[PDB]
């Protein structure tokens, strides 16, 4: 309706591959090469015709084999549209936990695409209403990936940050703080005064991690903080954060 179009070469072959595609439900041909012919806008659109969603988890994992070996690799932005076509929908829609081709398929992409595969799902998934345990396991496997290198790590925690804070980010969040990213002071501002504005374990956990993993960067003021939002018996580890409290005193 909003009548972009897609590529002359990726109009005429389109056919082609969604015949390609059928196959694979049943080393890449030129025809997947066309995929560079997209800006992103124009690869949402085709992603979208070519009913990618749709796909049998085996038809995934083969196509993902096939993207992993595309040279050269696909831009960050591309790659980032290509990933939310192929896994948005499936892991949007777990009662349980991913299927063994399901998880097969994510991770051997994201072992390749690492930050474009969680800067990817991250927003949406955990944006999503009702997300659990199967959407926030596979978020927490993607960002715990030793391929997700340092600067992506960093990356990941400010977008991260931005998000409205809920139980499903902080398991999330925990589990990056986990692999001591690096943080900049301003960083390190949003995360504490985010914390110190609570029933839940994972936030009893997150909590903990902080205090004890990055003890250095917390400052008097933070402290303080830290200490109001801990007065009351009803927070889990009390014992725990009473302690990592007193460390920092």
């Given at each position: 309706a909003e009548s972009l179009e897609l590529p002359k070469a990726i109009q005429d072959q389109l056919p082609r591959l969604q015949q390609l595609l059928k196959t694979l439900e049943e080393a890449p041909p030129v025809?997947?090469?066309?995929?560079?012919?997209?800006?992103p806008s124009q690869m949402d659109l085709l992603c979208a015709q070519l009913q990618l969603?749709?796909?049998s988890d085996l038809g995934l994992l083969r196509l993902c084999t096939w993207l992993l070996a595309l040279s050269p690799d696909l831009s960050l932005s591309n790659a980032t549209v290509l990933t939310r076509s192929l896994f948005l929908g499936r892991i949007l829609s777990l009662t349980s936990s991913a299927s063994r081709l399901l998880t097969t398929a994510l991770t051997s992409f994201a072992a390749k695409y690492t930050y474009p595969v969680c800067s990817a799902l991250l927003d949406p998934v955990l944006q999503?209403?009702?997300?659990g345990p199967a959407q926030t396991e596979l978020l927490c496997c993607l960002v715990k990936?030793?391929?997700?290198?340092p600067d992506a790590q960093v990356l990941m925690l400010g977008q991260i940050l931005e998000l409205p804070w809920k139980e499903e980010t902080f398991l999330v969040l925990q589990s990056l703080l986990e692999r001591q990213v690096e943080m900049t002071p301003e960083k390190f501002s949003v995360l504490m005064e985010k914390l110190c504005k609570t029933t839940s374990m994972a936030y009893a956990k997150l909590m903990l991690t902080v205090m004890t993993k990055y003890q250095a960067n917390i400052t008097e003021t933070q402290r303080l903080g830290l200490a109001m939002a801990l007065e009351?018996?009803?927070?889990?580890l009390r014992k725990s954060l009473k302690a990592a409290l007193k460390h920092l005193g």
């Open positions: 025809e997947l090469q066309l995929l560079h012919e997209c800006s969603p749709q796909l999503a209403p009702g997300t990936m030793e391929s997700l290198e009351p018996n009803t927070t889990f």
